[PDB]
Amino acid sequence: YALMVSNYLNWMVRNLADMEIQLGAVKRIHALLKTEAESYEGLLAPSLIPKNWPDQGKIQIQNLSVRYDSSLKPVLKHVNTLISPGQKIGICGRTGSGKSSFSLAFFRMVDMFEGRIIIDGIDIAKLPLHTLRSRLSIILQDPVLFSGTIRFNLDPEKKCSDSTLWEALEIAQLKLVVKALPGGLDAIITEGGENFSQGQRQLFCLARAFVRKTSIFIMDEATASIDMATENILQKVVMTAFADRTVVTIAHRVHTILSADLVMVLKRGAILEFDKPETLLSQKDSVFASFV
Amino acid sequence: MLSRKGIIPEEYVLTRLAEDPTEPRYRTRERRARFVSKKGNCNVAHKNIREQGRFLQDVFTTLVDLKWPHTLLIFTMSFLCSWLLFAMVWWLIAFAHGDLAPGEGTNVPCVTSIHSFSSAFLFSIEVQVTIGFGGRMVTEECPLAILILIVQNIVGLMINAIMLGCIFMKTAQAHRRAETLIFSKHAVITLRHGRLCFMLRVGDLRKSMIISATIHMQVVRKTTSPEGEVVPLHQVDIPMENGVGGNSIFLVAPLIIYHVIDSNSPLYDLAPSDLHHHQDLEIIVILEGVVETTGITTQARTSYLADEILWGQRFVPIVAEEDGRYSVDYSKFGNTVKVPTPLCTARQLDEDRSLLDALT
Amino acid sequence: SVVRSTVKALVSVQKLSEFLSSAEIREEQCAPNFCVQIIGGFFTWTPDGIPTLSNITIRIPRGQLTMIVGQVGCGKSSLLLATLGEMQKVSGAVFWNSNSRGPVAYASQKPWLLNATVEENITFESPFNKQRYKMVIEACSLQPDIDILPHGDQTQIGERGINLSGGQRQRISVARALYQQTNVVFLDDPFSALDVHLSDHLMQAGILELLRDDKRTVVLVTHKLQYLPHADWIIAMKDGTIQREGTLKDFQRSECQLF
Amino acid sequence: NKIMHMSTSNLSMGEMTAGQICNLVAIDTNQLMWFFFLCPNLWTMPVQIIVGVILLYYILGVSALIGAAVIILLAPVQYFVATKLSQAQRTTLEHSNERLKQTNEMLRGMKLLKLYAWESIFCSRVEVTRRKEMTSLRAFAVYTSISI
Amino acid sequence: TGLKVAKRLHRSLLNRIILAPMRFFETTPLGSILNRFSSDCNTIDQHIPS
Numbered sequence A: 001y002a003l004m005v006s007n008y009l010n011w012m013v014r015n016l017a018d019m020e021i022q023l024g025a026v027k028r029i030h031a032l033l034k035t036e037a038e039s040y041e042g043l044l045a046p047s048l049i050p051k052n053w054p055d056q057g058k059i060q061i062q063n064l065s066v067r068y069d070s071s072l073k074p075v076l077k078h079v080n081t082l083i084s085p086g087q088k089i090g091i092c093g094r095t096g097s098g099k100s101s102f103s104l105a106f107f108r109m110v111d112m113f114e115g116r117i118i119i120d121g122i123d124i125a126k127l128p129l130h131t132l133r134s135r136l137s138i139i140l141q142d143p144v145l146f147s148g149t150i151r152f153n154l155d156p157e158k159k160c161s162d163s164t165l166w167e168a169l170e171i172a173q174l175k176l177v178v179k180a181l182p183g184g185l186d187a188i189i190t191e192g193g194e195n196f197s198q199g200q201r202q203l204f205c206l207a208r209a210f211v212r213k214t215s216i217f218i219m220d221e222a223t224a225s226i227d228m229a230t231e232n233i234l235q236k237v238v239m240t241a242f243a244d245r246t247v248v249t250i251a252h253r254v255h256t257i258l259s260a261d262l263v264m265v266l267k268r269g270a271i272l273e274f275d276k277p278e279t280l281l282s283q284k285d286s287v288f289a290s291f292v
Numbered sequence B: 001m002l003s004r005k006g007i008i009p010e011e012y013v014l015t016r017l018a019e020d021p022t023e024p025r026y027r028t029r030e031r032r033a034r035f036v037s038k039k040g041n042c043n044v045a046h047k048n049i050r051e052q053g054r055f056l057q058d059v060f061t062t063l064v065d066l067k068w069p070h071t072l073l074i075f076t077m078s079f080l081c082s083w084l085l086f087a088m089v090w091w092l093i094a095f096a097h098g099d100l101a102p103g104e105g106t107n108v109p110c111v112t113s114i115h116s117f118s119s120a121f122l123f124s125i126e127v128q129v130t131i132g133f134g135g136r137m138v139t140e141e142c143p144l145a146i147l148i149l150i151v152q153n154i155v156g157l158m159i160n161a162i163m164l165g166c167i168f169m170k171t172a173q174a175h176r177r178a179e180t181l182i183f184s185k186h187a188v189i190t191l192r193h194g195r196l197c198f199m200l201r202v203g204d205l206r207k208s209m210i211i212s213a214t215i216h217m218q219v220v221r222k223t224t225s226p227e228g229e230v231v232p233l234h235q236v237d238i239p240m241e242n243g244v245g246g247n248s249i250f251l252v253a254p255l256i257i258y259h260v261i262d263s264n265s266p267l268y269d270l271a272p273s274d275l276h277h278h279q280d281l282e283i284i285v286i287l288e289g290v291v292e293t294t295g296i297t298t299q300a301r302t303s304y305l306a307d308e309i310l311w312g313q314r315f316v317p318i319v320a321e322e323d324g325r326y327s328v329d330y331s332k333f334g335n336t337v338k339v340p341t342p343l344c345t346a347r348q349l350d351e352d353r354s355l356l357d358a359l360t
Numbered sequence C: 001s002v003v004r005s006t007v008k009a010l011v012s013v014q015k016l017s018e019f020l021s022s023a024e025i026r027e028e029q030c031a032p033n034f035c036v037q038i039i040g041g042f043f044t045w046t047p048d049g050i051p052t053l054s055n056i057t058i059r060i061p062r063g064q065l066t067m068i069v070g071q072v073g074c075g076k077s078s079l080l081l082a083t084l085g086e087m088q089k090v091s092g093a094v095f096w097n098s099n100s101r102g103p104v105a106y107a108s109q110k111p112w113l114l115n116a117t118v119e120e121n122i123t124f125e126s127p128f129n130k131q132r133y134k135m136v137i138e139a140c141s142l143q144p145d146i147d148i149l150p151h152g153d154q155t156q157i158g159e160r161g162i163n164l165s166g167g168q169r170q171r172i173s174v175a176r177a178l179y180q181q182t183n184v185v186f187l188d189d190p191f192s193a194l195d196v197h198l199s200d201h202l203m204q205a206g207i208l209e210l211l212r213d214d215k216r217t218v219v220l221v222t223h224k225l226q227y228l229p230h231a232d233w234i235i236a237m238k239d240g241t242i243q244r245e246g247t248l249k250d251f252q253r254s255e256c257q258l259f
Numbered sequence D: 001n002k003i004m005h006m007s008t009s010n011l012s013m014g015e016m017t018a019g020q021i022c023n024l025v026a027i028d029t030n031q032l033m034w035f036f037f038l039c040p041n042l043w044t045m046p047v048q049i050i051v052g053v054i055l056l057y058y059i060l061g062v063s064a065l066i067g068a069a070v071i072i073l074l075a076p077v078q079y080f081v082a083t084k085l086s087q088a089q090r091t092t093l094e095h096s097n098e099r100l101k102q103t104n105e106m107l108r109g110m111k112l113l114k115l116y117a118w119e120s121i122f123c124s125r126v127e128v129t130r131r132k133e134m135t136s137l138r139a140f141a142v143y144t145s146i147s148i
Numbered sequence E: 001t002g003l004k005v006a007k008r009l010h011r012s013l014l015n016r017i018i019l020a021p022m023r024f025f026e027t028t029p030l031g032s033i034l035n036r037f038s039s040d041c042n043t044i045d046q047h048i049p050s
Ligand SMILES: CCCCCCCCCCCCCCCCCC(=O)OC[C@H](COP(=O)(O)OC[C@H](N)C(=O)O)OC(=O)CCCCCCCCCCCCCCCCC
Pocket: B053, B056, B057, B058, B059, B081, B082, B085, B151, B155
């Protein structure tokens, strides 16, 4: 046994060193497991007290000011502009203030909002967070698509049985993709949108809004896309604002929002201009001067 | 095998980008290295020396540099090694002679009374230390004993003479007198007679005068020449503003030493706003004379970094005129009191003088 | 497991021996006067026959900014690479020389970005001078992009770091080519991927000042409408051959290469 | 050095991608180095076992050889265990790479997910892929338990 | 024990990261999360048991 102690000592130390390093990885894993955040619940009875599905989206903004850390600087400064139910709203505000303020009020994503912010009239705090965003549409700027069946991509959460999904991908935009898809509706996207279009997600968002009864709508700036896409978006907004009665645009191409029912503009911390019509937009040459 | 040894040589995996790791490297705790410490003992470490035995050639000088504990041990080892080696020689020669086995026989011992090695060791002690008890004589029998007696006496005298010389050079050491020379912990820059100068105070504590004192002074800054040279530590000499220019000084009371910052000084462009800790400057002072008792030359070394300087302050007067004689109140040796001074550089003051003096 | 490691080593050596004896860019005696001097230019990409470029007869000394244009896939990138010497040569006399070879600047249609600091990604192992650096980045309009990057010039650009988009990659790639301060410059479609007039012409104006100061060539291979014709020399090609590299008057007489 | 002198023909360079050559430098060279680590073993372990067997017979006799032969005859079974372990590990590791790629794509557009409330679908899909990889890992755990 | 630990830890990690504020994702470098999800998970899966 004294002959075997000579290497038991060595391998005990070696295994101890290896165990130390591997448990450091466990410490880092558990450290990320200690991020006890993102409380998802409802601090109210949500069966009937809040709106089952937002329809008008009357923004009774009660001096809702958002700041993520609430100590560095605010993103909104008492942003109070009432929404325009029954008509589109194209607000080509500066991305500095308007974008952050709108996202926090509509999605409750930036929880630290000084005061209260309510969409659909009832407070957004008194509904489940996942449910609150499950009955609302939104589009983004940077295209983000994964790989999978398109019929399992348009409505994955609800597992809809509607065969109209293919119609949305054949009528709203990218008609030729149906012939380019060997599978059709069940066809699996290739490499997360390899060479389809910049706005394949636009068709998916339209399908979700048409399915999930998403009366309200959110729009974001287009980095680069054919003008026909904005024309189809405008027509979809006319459909969304004549039937669902609400659609909100946010970008910095002013001429996109120029042809709209309403308009707003934000500057350096909060909203700087508000107007129910678009006549004041041309009257206040500040808007189009920033454009061109 | 208890060790974790198995089939995993590939180690092929993709790891995401990692940045800003937690490590104790936010700040550099170590400050600027002092070129010479406040007690002499320069803090410069030689490296990559191509040794050629020069350290070991001068054993005598090496012995002097040794501490007294190690010198005593080497002193002891030298004597003990010689004593014991010749004890073997005396024991072996007697043993070979056959006069070690006792008996009432015809044999007559060459070295009487040698019975064991213990008596041989004691006889070696007697011969080399010249104790000469004489119970263990050297007889006329074997001539080799006479030869070895001559050799042992000569070797003992040589080792005694060498150790005497070393002890005479070690008891004349004055490295423990140079440590009673005192420099103020922090030096000052303050105006005198209208011209700025770098004052300082140096004093002697004991009563034994140091003859022919000599206060040199050097500035140690990295230098980039107009030609582009790179000297990491350039040493520029510094005057002493003495009445005759020479470096000599007579030190009984703690005198004030100051470098008048003339047009040819390397301090000529220093401002108090650039006198922080991480300023690459250092002022060395070298007080070398001959101690009157031992006659051995000594040095005293001190340094003043940037942070050690104290702008615009004057040393407190120390000497007083008491009843019998003068007094030196060493409790005020290093006390500085602020004096009304400009914050301008030396060249800024020169410019101000250049214009103000030329009123007409 | 010892024998297993020996077996794995045998597989690795088989793999390494096959790789080590693959094709080499030193073929056709590649490794042992006008800059763009090509007599016949029977280039190739398959080592033994099957050429994809030939009939190259262009003689161009220095100080000749010559924009290469043509149809899609008509010997544009192939000839740009062949100018450096990476194309297998069968029957063609070429003598590159400059006032032996020089730091031939270049780029491709495909963005290549080092997984390094953005400022490093621009200087590319060259001495860091802020004078030309500021001019080139301003011309490249990468500063507006750096107004959103957290560390800006310090972010880990490219793969193994900060993920970006095609447009930003184009700006960075062309900036790296400009800053190198080389007496020849071989661009490759800086305009096809990103086609904004203002920023492209800003870089063009900055290129005009510096290039012409050193009389350095700039082969702006592209199909941009504005400078499709130029007051400087031009070259056009189709189906792996070039007609004539000179004035635009012959192009008008052809009545086929006009806008 | 042979990267520098290598042509970029689509026939050649279009087949050996950057991933392939990176794997070569990593996998092949590390396992070739490990061969050079264990080269003395194949020159000694033969002598080690031979000398051990010889003087083990001298010490005790024939039953010691029988016990040693049990170890020798169990070597083929343990070689198979190590072989099956490595094979199952590589299958599990390629499966883990697929799952890791899905999670990269998931945690890449998280904003586009949560705003569209696409957290549940991708989370459930990753869990199902984890179940597949876990069955493969269960075979791996079985084989390594046999090894110990 | 090692296999059971890996399974439950992985599902807890997936649940926690999925249900996290999106501002945390945009603020975190996302290389740390990916590292502790890919490389660290591999180490606890195929090394810590043995
Ligand atoms: C270690 C012993 C080495 C010598 C062994 C015997 C050699 C006899 C030399 C006789 C001359 C013939 C050849 C000359 C060799 C010269 C050796 C010599 O000089 O080195 C002695 C050393 C170092 O000196 P160095 O730097 O080399 O000198 C300059 C040199 N010539 C040059 O090249 O520039 O000097 C020193 O650094 C000090 C050395 C003193 C050694 C004393 C040892 C302790 C003795 C105590 C016990 C006494 C024993 C008595 C025994 C008696 C038995 C009967």
